[PDB]
Each structure stands twice: as structure tokens, then as C-alpha cells.
Write a protein that binds this ligand. Structure first.
Ligand SMILES: [K+]
Ligand SMILES: [K+]
Ligand SMILES: [K+]
Lengths: 283, 283, 283, 283
């Protein structure tokens, strides 16, 4: 019954048409977006066609009072193909022409921006260790997990937050869900390029100090990771979030090493070891 | 007589043509912007038309010395419909043609950028509690208000500032308006997704320490909220501001709750309760 | 003989073709930029024309072996006017056609970005007090100056740096220019909207502590101001810099006030007072 | 056998098609990118051509059932040249027409964004001293290197990180690589314009305290520099990274000086001295 999913998205039921137009256009699925555009496209040409007929027989080589001919003319026009069979006749015809044109291009201008706006979304090539572990490092138990960059490009002034979420009681006895930042031995990495193992020493200041497994389940406590940085690939900021549940903490585990020396004597990164955690089994 | 409005915009009278072109173009109302563009469009084609006539009878199938014909030709040319009735004749005609073309597309290039520049502005889907309250939490009064995210998308590394603005006297006796940043128990929320109740404990460090209602009116003091964060919807930064007056502080009040358990046993959010503040009435 | 000019640009002599293409294109003056584009435009069409002639007589209604005809055809083709007199003939002709097209639009795509890149530069509407003053505020002498926003739109997350630059001697006796950032009583203003008077208290920590005028001239010391913030007008970041020399510090001065109460009882801003500094003259 | 290259890119062997489409498109060499686009272009027109043939003889003046004719028609249609020889016939023909158009325009919209996305990348004009030096400044040994801005434009709120990377042993005996950010006497420069000599005093807090050369080689330790700032040239953020190996530290060296006084008495910047380091040779 987790508040937060693994993908980091909160897991709640929300209780609530043209109001949020811009958001909605960037939020819709590509199929839909393309449809909408199409609809709009067809629609407006039809409208324009009617305008033509309305004037009445103002297009060269158009079957009299036929909406198709006018429509297709309108596309050839708006789109500025301007084949040349169907042509404006008389001031009224042409004014509508020079109006459509402008309309068409403006639409392109609007479509473009939407496209570009929705199209230009980078994604940190970042991979999260499927598990956390609690184990002794430098003489104090420490909670860790690790990120691997999935691309050759580097992430600059990357940094990460390790947030514990769990239930608490106020002195007043309000029983709420609280967020605790957890101090990391290293929270900034100005140049993140291969792997980073993040650590929260556990000492008298850690909100998870002297806590067993039993106690963690009991506060229904999870761990939320937010990573962010400036990706050289995109020359644009990127982020990535992940969440862990009490039971994805492997007590005493140790992340295996992904750094190797080749036969060649050249260093290397093996991603295969990335999700592997060493463990002592005591029968 | 408030210095700051609810929308957070300061409430002062300011005492002060082509100077600020770029700002103005992004600042104008869409109707106006479109008009301007249109004007510019029509205008330039007229100019071009004149250029054509000026050469004299250089367009196929054009009524001799008729501006309309030239004008409409110019549009068909500059929008590159290029129907094909009206056509250039001779070097002068065509040079003007190849000039217009380029002109037209440059205009598109300029129009586009403006459009995109004005078009691409997100808005945090954030709603502010209409009131603040001063109530005891964990043993110290605390001033609070709360934000609710209005969209399914999440806001990352969101954070908020609670600023008290009020009149003061210097030892030197300068009577000025000063801004105090009020320490919040929680000022960052790396993953804002549903509701956030912001709190400023009031203790010997709070500029509103041991202050009643009477004293607040007296310094003509208001409270300004700035919220900001990176919206996943837009993959871009968003902000929202709000302001409160002394009298929108509900002393002793408690925000009602918005988190529920369904019959189903599934957690939920209710945004009807959002503006509701519990209160004790003592006859 | 100032190191820094009033406009904040350093005042030094620097001692040093296709290398910096992108910078150069954004750095050039509009006339020039347009020329370059034009040149490129004309040029490429000429090249294309030659390609056509090179096939030989492959365009309908073209005077045999005539470059003009080919050239103008090439424009009508690359701008996609496609009038319809001059037309491709045979495979070679048309392939070149379908190649040009693509070329043309790609050029548009490149031109656009440049245009937009150079076009979309905001400027903080910020005005700097022409002078600084040193005077007692809240019981310690304080250096100050002030900014006024020149537009109705607000600046978010605005903040400012007050940097003293002056010559120093190392224990080793290196005589260098050093920068001292000066602690301001208020360095962030999450919502800058009208005027902000920035202050650097002078106490045992101020690098200008117990310094007279004489001593300031002597270290040839100046004061550099950098302001930056996110402008709601442009929905984009803005900055502004300014510099002051030792002699633009008005000792004992006090900035006059720009905030008024109207007859109406409505508050107001008078930016005429903005540069005015009160002063005591003692015969 | 360095972990990090001079360009700051980590020097490891990574061990691991349509997955990363957007990154890949921005990452590919211009030649390749253009090819891809071209391919896509040609391809889609061919597809469209087939669509035409498939209806069968629906284009005016088209050799019956010939792909070339259809193909070239398709381009004239999709690029909206619309010459006018080949023309749609009947409903099926034209619908495909009005579909292509839109398609073409959308492609432009997509191409543009890619172009602009890849095209609009600035590069800090920043040059790194080829060497570092360890030498006494103001009475404590200090590690330094220096940056020179290579362009007339200025970089705002520039700042730099000096990171030591070297192998260590945990008490638990884990032998890992660790990063130490090294406190710099000056880490921000709100207005970087000519040269900046960065310094890390070495004292009881420096992770390189009481370390000789021998000891540095031994921990296989390098030094990583990240510089970043907002470039006025591009009105956009820029960064630059560099790395140094133990052996590019010139002990006792002193950077020569690049600031000069002209005969004219005007100050100047010479960048020939930039890489020059003074040294005492003791036979
Ligand atoms: K056309
Ligand atoms: K066209
Ligand atoms: K045509």
C-alpha cells in the first residue's frame, strides 16, 4: 500500500475543458496531438471553403457551388502549394486568399512551437541501483544506493537528495506523513560521468538512527531519491527520480564493484555488476 | 488600502514609442499582436506592389497600372503561393520577386520567434489557501498557509518564501517599509505533488514574535508568498506568488484536512476542504 | 584612469575567420547579419543555376544558356513560389530541384534559429542610483545604493552583489587587484517590483572598515554592482551591472524618498527623486 | 594511465537502436544528421509516390504508372513548390495532397527544432593554464591555476570548482576512488572578464596537506576543474572543464604575470605569458 511508486510518482487518488490549453497540448499523447492538429487543419479549410462558396463561384475551374473543389483549393492555397488550376476571381476571392496565406503560416508558427516545446525534453541517462543497502562504511553504519549514467556525455554540477518519508506523531498527537532530508556524505558532484555511490551516514542525527527493519516497516517508511544536473548532451538541465520501500533495503549488503582493470591494463566499467549486491549468509 | 494585492502584485501608482520594441511585442494582447503583424504584412505588400508598378506593367495578366492586381500578386509572391496567372516580366520584375521571397520567409522567421516567445509561458498549477492561520503546532504557534498542486504532473525541487512586509522606525527615525524573510520549518520540497502546508514557527527570532492582531494592523503589515519549482508538465521552471493582509490571518484557526481513506482503502485528495479552517468559538 | 567603466564593462586593452562562427553570427550588427544571409542566399542560387546550366537547357521557357533565367528559376524553386513558367525537364533537372527544396528549407531552419537566438534578448528594466552614499543606518555606518524597476512587470528571485575592487599588497609584497564581495543586509529579494535600497553595513568585517575618502582614492578602489533576476515580462532571466568610483560615494548623504501618499490617499512612486541624495552642509 | 583526460572526460572503457532517439539526433555529426534527414525526406516521398500510384493515374501530365514522375510530384507537392504540370485528379489524389502538405510542414517543424537545438550551443571562451603550481602565497603554501577569458564579452556570476580525485582505503579496507572539493580562497567571481587565478590554500584542512610529490603519484591523484558562468555573448550559460595530473603540478613555480602597462600608459592583457611559470633552479 505504498504512498510512492518506484518510478517516484506519488500514488494517490485525485478528487476534482479549454481551461489549461497550453499544458494540455504538451501533455497529450502524440497520436492525439497530431489528430487535434489535423482536425484543426481540416476544419479551418472547410470554413475557408465556405467563405469561398459564400462569395459564390469565385474560383477558376471550380465546379459551381461544390464544397470539395473549394476545400482542396483552400489547402493548395494555405499551404501555399498554389498549383494554379483553381485561382481566385475578383477582389473578394483574393482578399480571402491573402488572408488564408497569413493564416496558414501563423498556424505553422504555432504548430512548430508546440512541436518544439513538446519535442525538446531531455532525459537524464541515469540508472538507479534497484536496491539500497545499510552497511558499515568508515566506521558508522551507512545507508547507500548508486546511479549510473547510461550515456558518454557528462552531467555537470549534478546533485542528489535522499529523502525519507514516513509516519510520525506530533506532541499534539497529529499522526502525519513527514519528509526528512538525509545528510549525505556527498551531495554535490560537479562532474558526474560514470557512477556515483551516494551515502547517508547513520549517527545520532540520522532520522533512521538505531532503527531496525521492524521499525521501518512500522512507520510505513520509504526513501525517495531526486537526482538533477546539467547534461552536456542536451546543454539543458535534466532530472531523474526514484523511490525505495523499506523492503528494498538490503541490510549488511555491499554493492559489488563495477570498476575493473582490463587485461590491457585499461580501466573499465561493467554494468552488469551495477545491480549486484554482495551478501554474507550465516546458515 | 493594501500595498500588495492578493495576486501578489504591488499596489502603487507609477509616475514617469519605439523605445522598448521587444518587450512591447511580448507584452501586447494577442488581438493587438495579431493586428500589428497583420498591419505589417499588408503594409509591406502594398510597398512591394508599388515597387512593381513603379517599374510599370511588369506582371503577366495584370490590369495595367492597377494596384490591387499588383498587391495581390505581391502576396501570392511573398507567401510563395505562386498561383501562376500573374507572373514576373523582365529582370526588374523578377529581382523584386527574389527579394520579396526572402523577405517573406525572414518575416516568418521573425513572427515565429515572437509567437514562440510569447506562446511558451507555463503556469504553476498552484493554488494558495485563501487564508493564513496562527495555530500551535509542536508547541510553538506557528503561522501557516498551504499550497495545492492543481495538476497530475509533479513539481521538482519546489520551494517557497514567506515574506512579512511592514513599516518600521530606525534608531535614526527613518520610517520605511521593510521585508523580513520568515524562517520556515520547511522551505524546500524536492518533490511537490499534492499539498504542502508551509509553517513559520513563531519564537524569539520571528519578527512577528509576541505580536497580536492589533500590532499587525498597526505596522500595516502584509505577508507575501513566493512559490517556485520545475514543472514536469512543461519541463521548465514555474512560479506563483500570493499576498495576504493582516486580516486574512485567522488566529487560533486550523486548516482542515485533505487526505482521506476511501471505502476502498485507497488514499485520496479532496480539494474541497482546501480553504476550510477549523475554529473554536467561545461564545 | 578607471579599471571599470560606469556601464560596468572592464576598461582594459586586449592583446591577441571561421573559428567562432556561432558567436560571430549572434554578435554581428543586424545590417551585417542580414547582408551575410542575403549574400549566402544569392550565392547558393547562383551555384544552383550553374548546376542547371551545367545539365543544359533543362528548364521550360528558359532562354537557352542563360544564367539569369536559371538563377531566377532557382529562386522560384528554392523559395517554393513555383510560379510555373520555368519548369524542370528530365531526371537530372528535377533531382536538383528536390535537392534545392530541401536545401532551402534547411536554410530557413538555420536562419530562424539565428534570428530567434539573436532576437530573444531581454534587458532588466533596472535603473541604478547614480551615486552611492555612506551614512549611519541602524547605528552603524552603511554603504548603500538603489535599484528601480523601470517596467510594470516584476522580477523574481532577484538578487544583487556589491563588489569592492581595489589594489592590495600581499605579505610577499605582490601588489594585485583584489575583489571583495561585501556582505549586504539583504542580498535576495524574491519579489523585486519597485525600488530596492541595497546596504552593506560597515563594521569590523567590512573590507572598507574605518576607511576615509582619502584611503579609498589611495587603493584606487571602485564598487561593482551586479543585479540579476527572472523577469516576468520575458519569462526569462535578466541581468544588469553598474560600477561606481571612489568619488561617486557621497559621504553622510541620505537617499531621498520616492514613496509618496497622494492627495487621494493612494500610495505612489515618484522616480524623479530616485537620484536625489539629502545632505547636511556645515558651512 | 590516467583516469581523467585533459579535456576532463573520464577515461574508462564502457561495457554494455531506437532507444535514445532524441539524444542520438543531437549527438550525431552534422554530415550524419543531414544524411538522416535526407534519407527520411527521400524515403517518405517515395512512400507517398506509391500511395499515388496505388490510386492509379491520378496526376495530370504524369507518365502512366512511373515512380519517378510520382516521386518528383510528391516532392513538388510536399515542399509546396506546386509547379503546376503535375496536378491532383479526383478526390483520392487530392486528399493525399492535403495530407502530404501538412506532413511536409510538420517535418519542417521537427527539423527546425533539431537544427536549433543542435545549433544553439555556446562555448565558454575560457582557456586553462596548462599547469598548476604549488607555492607560498600570503604565508601558506597554495595550489593554484588560472583561467583566461578568450573573448571581449564578459561572464557573469562565474564560478569554479577545484576537485582532487585520488584512491583511498577505508578502515573496513574498501579501496575506492574519492572526490574532495578543495576550498578556494575565491570561488565566485560575479564578473569574470580577463584572467582569474584560482587558489586553494593548503592548511590542516586541505586534503593535500603535508603531501609531497611522491605521495600524490602514490594515490594516483588528479585535479579536476569545472568552470561555469553566464556568457554575455550568448546570453546563455556556458561551462568548461579541465583536468590535471600529479605531474602537471609545478612545485615552487609561480605563474608569470599577463597584465601590462603600455607605453601609452594604458593597461592591457597579453595571453602569451598565460602558460608561463616562473621557477627557481638550484643547480
Ligand atoms: K507554390
Ligand atoms: K510555398
Ligand atoms: K505554381
Amino acid at each position: 500500500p505504498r504512498i510512492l511508486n518506484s518510478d517516484g510518482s506519488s500514488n494517490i487518488t485525485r478528487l476534482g475543458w479549454l481551461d489549461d490549453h497550453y499544458h494540455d497540448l504538451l501533455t497529450v499523447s502524440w497520436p492525439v496531438f497530431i489528430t487535434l492538429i489535423t482536425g484543426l487543419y481540416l476544419v479551418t479549410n472547410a470554413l475557408f471553403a465556405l467563405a469561398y462558396l459564400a462569395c459564390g463561384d469565385v474560383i477558376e475551374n471550380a465546379r459551381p457551388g461544390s464544397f470539395t473543389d473549394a476545400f482542396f483549393f483552400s489547402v493548395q492555397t494555405m499551404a501555399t502549394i498554389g498549383y494554379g488550376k483553381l485561382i481566385p476571381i475578383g477582389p473578394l476571392a483574393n482578399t480571402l486568399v491573402t488572408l488564408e496565406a497569413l493564416c496558414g503560416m501563423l498556424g505553422l508558427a504555432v504548430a512548430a512551437s508546440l512541436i518544439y516545446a513538446r519535442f525538446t525534453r531531455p532525459t537524464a541517462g541515469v540508472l538507479f541501483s534497484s536496491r539500497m543497502v545499510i552497511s558499515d562504511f568508515e566506521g558508522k553504519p551507512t545507508l547507500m544506493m548508486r546511479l549510473a549514467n547510461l550515456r558518454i556525455e557528462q552531467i555537470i554540477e549534478a546533485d542528489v537528495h535522499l529523502v525519507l518519508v514516513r509516519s510520525e506523531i506530533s506532541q499534539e498527537g497529529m499522526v502525519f506523513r513527514r519528509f526528512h532530508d538525509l545528510t549525505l556524505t556527498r551531495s554535490r558532484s560537479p562532474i558526474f560521468s560514470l557512477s556515483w555511490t551516494v551515502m547517508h551516514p547513520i549517527d545520532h542525527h540520522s532520522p533512521i538512527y538505531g532503527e531496525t527493519d521492524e521499525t521501518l516497516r512500522n512507520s510505513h517508511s520509504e526513501f525517495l531519491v531526486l537526482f538533477t544536473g546539467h547534461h552536456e548532451a542536451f546543454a539543458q538541465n535534466v532530472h531523474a527520480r526514484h523511490a525505495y520501500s523499506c523492503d528494498e533495503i538490503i541490510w549488511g549488503g555491499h554493492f559489488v564493484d563495477v570498476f575493473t582493470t582490463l587485461p590491457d591494463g585499461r580501466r573499465a566499467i561493467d554494468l552488469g555488476k551495477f545491480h549486484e549486491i554482495a551478501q554474507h549468509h550465516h546458515h
